[model samples]
Target: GQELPPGTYRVDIYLNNGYMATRDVTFNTGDSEQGIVPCLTRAQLASMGLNTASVAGMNLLADDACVPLTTMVQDATAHLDVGQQRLNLTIPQAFMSNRARGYIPPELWDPGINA
Candidate 1:
């Protein structure tokens, strides 16, 4: 079996209101696989009143509306574990702070939930 090449990739997350967030990720060979687990920072998670420890203990679905963080990519490696694949993509942030303005009301627990 041959190893895969290494490269950098971009990932984008889209919100219901057409908003988007982008992140850059690096992939390398040798690693059997990887998982892109979307996560929010402690502060961001706290803002949602989500008990991080409790959530971790329970395998509950994440609130899609108020995703704290999103993974850009997962299992980005050269070795083909199950199948071979080729991918080329471009992801741009849809509604970045430079492009949009306004504060999300505290009452809106979810992103654009009350919008």
Candidate 2:
């Protein structure tokens, strides 16, 4: 097993096995399981469907951006599939909503030909 040179890359991001978005992420050497860790911004994570509201006392960078997932969510991890050019984000179930996962509000349903 080898590691890619530290640099920024554009890779597909997956949240809980579901493809979310592609982002230019920074990979650097770290003392973690991945050896190299990927960095993401608050906005980037938010765009990928992270529910910041559910978490309490969340801190952000000076510009109100860069943050560590560990501080944001308990037991959350980000894995990089370099060969596949994908980043798999395993987050807690309560941190995200199920709207796009096929659950639509009953009131929003439209009447079809059956009407």
Candidate 3:
């Protein structure tokens, strides 16, 4: 794969029949070809309506998972080094937005399943 230019980008991950996990990333020239792992704690997943058992089952079904990380590069963007070991990403905002439906919730954080 070719190296990507530096800019703010939206990265999304899908697993288990195309269930989505998304995050926003800001990449600079200093960070390229680096491994960036999104933080997903078990507790957090549960809070977001995903149970531990479900995640475990998905992991078992797939040996090697495919993760597609995408970021947009614009004009005047910095050049990526393509040699950095890792990119420390801080996901400042994470949520789903539906522009077509004109829906924007103030808080998208799920409180967890109620028994």
Candidate 4:
């Protein structure tokens, strides 16, 4: 019931339910839950904070083309919400960056000026 036609869609990407980026992505006919799958580029993957280097067998290609998320990471899933133009991405925690979402680290906290 949630199948989308094959075409290009500009939608917001969410990694692990966290909002990531908004960009134009492609959807093609394939064996997926959506009947079509979303394709992402190297640039997009990097922007989502995915540890690309940690994954193996990735072709060193320019940022123009796109690749399936599953090919890049094991057990990665992508769901597109046609209504709100949102793409939800679920990747393994270990494959993602360990840093916090946002904000200064405790090491950078200033103890304050001496009294």
Candidate 5:
């Protein structure tokens, strides 16, 4: 209970690597949140085989990793219709687009045998 604000808005520590990492954090009220979106540097974003209009030149030196888009549920409202039903879930950091979105062929799920 002894912790207290120093009457300031600031951060005094930093990364000592040849390059440092940081992002914009707006101090404000009433939003219950934060900012510092996972963003890409202009050039880093361009190298992803994107259109020329995407490259403006920036991060690949910060956290330097990007990921495919995904979520706990593609449609949040889609899960609301059940009585005592639950979809156990897990998330992987990576995967192929087709496999993640594709249904297993009956051959794969059926195991070629009668259950």
Candidate 6:
């Protein structure tokens, strides 16, 4: 219910999930045609540079409001070995935030896990 002296406009469909495709409408041209919208899929995401497997497992934990990556990574260094050839890096509690909630990645990356 809007007025237009325009050339074209794109109609979009979206919600909490995300969005894709568009329906273009041309005004003042006196011609009409059906618009088509396509469905999105896993392969389609890959074409758009998203890989499910790669994105599935990741550490998305949060850090302090103020902390540089250089500093963060530096502070995370555990100066000694937990064992042979293994370094236990730990970030200071001040710089650590709550663990991620819901939709956790595939692995916890904990050293204690086996089998």
Top-lDDT structure, candidate number: 4
TM-score of model 5 vs. true structure:
0.17
Please give each candidate's TM-score: 0.21, 0.67, 0.24, 0.68, 0.17, 0.22
Better of 2 and 6 by TM-score: 2
**What tens digits encode model 6's per-residue C-alpha lDDT throughout 1-115?**
2222234333442221234323332223221121111222223222222322332322232311111221223332221121232212233333333232322221321212222
Q: Could you give candidate 4's per-residue lDDT for residues 2-109 as a string of tens digits? A: 576656766667888888755566678765776788765544565676655556633345443455677667887777787788888888865665322222321222
Estimate, for each residue in 65-105, the C-alpha lDDT of model 1 and write its tens digit.
32223222221112222232222222223211221112232
Per-residue error (Å), model 2, residue 81: 0.8
TM-score of 2: 0.67
Which model is ahead, 1 or 6, in terms of TM-score? 6
Question: Where does candidate 6 have its weakest 10-residue lDDT segment?
Answer: 29-38
Q: Can you write out model 5's per-residue Cα lDDT over 2-111, one digit (the tens) per residue?
A: 22222222221121111121222112221111211122222222222222221222121222333211221121110110133221112222211222212222233221
**TM-score rank, highest first?**
4, 2, 3, 6, 1, 5
Winning model by TM-score: 4
Give each prediction's root-mean-square deviation over alpha carbons: 13.7, 11.3, 14.7, 11.9, 20.3, 23.4
Q: Is candidate 3 or candidate 4 better by lDDT?
A: 4
The per-candidate count of clashes, in order, stands at: 1, 0, 0, 0, 4, 0
The collision pairs in model 1 are 4-78
Model 4 scores worst on lDDT over the 10 consecutive residues at 106-115
lDDT of 2 by residue, 1-115 (tens): 4566446777777987988855466767653466776665544555566655555533223213445676567777777887788888877866754323222222223112122
- The better candidate by TM-score, 2 or 4, is 4
Better model by lDDT, 1 or 6? 1
